[model samples]
Target: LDAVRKRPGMYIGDTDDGTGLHHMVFEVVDNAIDEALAGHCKEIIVTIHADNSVSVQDDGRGIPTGIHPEEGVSAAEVIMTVLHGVGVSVVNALSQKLELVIQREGKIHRQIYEHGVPQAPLAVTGETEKTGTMVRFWPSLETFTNVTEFEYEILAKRLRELSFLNSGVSIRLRDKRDGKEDHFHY
Candidate 1:
């Protein structure tokens, strides 16, 4: 966490506003990719809340809720609190970021943080039947100064790009900010 904070630009290109906004999207996409790589998820949906907060949901197995061999914490906790040692650097280095909410068996677990500080801890909120993850986050405007505006068309293009790159995966991008939605299936 400290390392990234000191060199935030190293991971997302800039600690400034634009990268800050994009980083949230990256996090959401990376989580989906993780599920795809594990062969547990095929579809991902990103809904932009009216307030500019965004949520990403997937029809994949929720993040493995097991013990972390080295951290001795829940795998989910480690994913939130720890960084890089788990082979996700490739995903982390990508430009867009997102906050993730993981749901399993009707129970929802949430962890909120930014740049690695816990805005909140893991807590269960509701009941869910299958396994999946939903990530809702509002970008930090203080950090991403230039992104005061959200662009739907650009977001849709990125979803299309992911579909093409990750053949067999489905990506949905919605701009609740403008009531526009697009679906991409690969």
Candidate 2:
């Protein structure tokens, strides 16, 4: 079911301009923002890369990467592979490529996917004492045709606004494509 890519308008409105493109970014970051409301997350960092790929990093509790009893895969993999009525998987479905890295307990669990399907099983890449989740993805240029790249001001405005309401959760925006970056905290 290619609900989003087949008909992006069904979920994200117009694929023209930059609305849908930016919504893709907002869609992902808002999850980390929700983590803040739950009281564990403190910061959310978003980076716009030169290739227009984006990454959202949070210092909240990393997603449980345990094997799912029913889904027959790691919980984290199921999260991204299926459209489980959540934006996380939706974002995965929309991206041309997606990578998830979870630093939980003593494991650096990693998984990679393409076109919303797991390219390989989740594997432990290294060791990390930290705890959090990071998702980096490239927008599907075919689906997001009109505007494949992100605009700094557009992203800044929303993240800036979120900072005011979600004050305790600091949101940082960094643009590696250029040189504009801001740390927002209220």
Candidate 3:
């Protein structure tokens, strides 16, 4: 995380240009599409809340929650802690704050991260029959340092590109700051 924070541009893109800023969103969305490509996901909903935080959700099989016996952490946390990891992993290290919620196995596992470190061990907050994973994050302004807000069309087009490439999956984006929204699926 220190290296990522030291060189924020290295993982996403350029810190000054909007290119890297938007990749933060794309990185998260890409993870959802992975589930879609794997045949376990059907629908993915992305929302830019009024707070400017972003969430990407999927109706696919959640990340395995079993403990990593050698690592002394849940598989989910171990996944989050991976260095040079996937979209789900990269965003956590890049965000100012992040919340991971996985609902499966009749339980909901939740964890909060601040600057890439888990705030607490993964905890089961409640019971749930639903099965999926939702990762919500606030991109760190200290890192992005430019283009602090997301452009709806930019996100829409990226998601549109994905839906078109993977016609079996549905992708939608909503903005809570205004009424603008989009859905792409086939």
Candidate 4:
């Protein structure tokens, strides 16, 4: 986490531009797209909140919530703590706050983190009919200086292209600040 804070451009190129700002969102979205590619995900929803937080939700097989035999910690924690697997960990490391919600086998598990450190062990939030993952995070204001707001058109264009490239995958991007929304399916 300190490494990321010291050199954010190393994980995400150019923190002083719109590209870096959008890169964070794309990194999270890419993970959901991978689930779609694996045939477990059908739809993904991305929201840009008024408070500058971004969330990516997918209706796929949620991340495994059980403990990892090798690591002796929940797989969810491994993903959040380790820097090798999901790219969202980089996002987690660079963000001021991050929350992950995983719905699996009729149960929902949630975990919170600050700068890549888990607040606590994964907690069973509730039960849900849905099965997927939701990652919400706010980029660190101190880490980035050039871009403060997420660009909807940039996000929409990328999602549209991804849907067109991957058959049977659909994605939606919504901006809560302006009530603007766009959907892509292919």
TM-score to true structure, per model: 0.78, 0.93, 0.94, 0.94
CA error at residue 100 for candidate 1, angstroms = 4.0
lDDT of 1 at 85: 19
Model 1 residue runs over 4 Å out of place are: 17-20, 36-41, 85-99, 119-121
Best by lDDT: 4
Per-residue lDDT for 1-186 in model 4, tens only?
577768888888778887777899989998988765654558899999999999998888888899999988999898877778327778888888999999899999999998888999998979888888899999988887878789889899889888888778889899999999988998
How many steric overlaps does candidate 2 have? 0
lDDT of 3: 0.84
Better of 1 and 4 by lDDT: 4
* Prediction 1 global C-alpha lDDT: 0.64
Q: Name the better of 1 and 3 by lDDT.
A: 3
**Consecutive 10-residue window with the lowest summed lDDT within model 3:** 81-90
Per-candidate Cα lDDT values, in order, are: 0.64, 0.83, 0.84, 0.86
- Clash pairs of candidate 4? none
Q: Residue 33's C-alpha lDDT in candidate 1?
A: 66
Measured with C-alpha atoms, the lDDT of residue 83 in candidate 4 is 70
Q: What's the CA error at residue 5 for candidate 3, in Å?
A: 1.4
lDDT of 1 at 27: 62
Model 3 per-residue lDDT at 142:
82
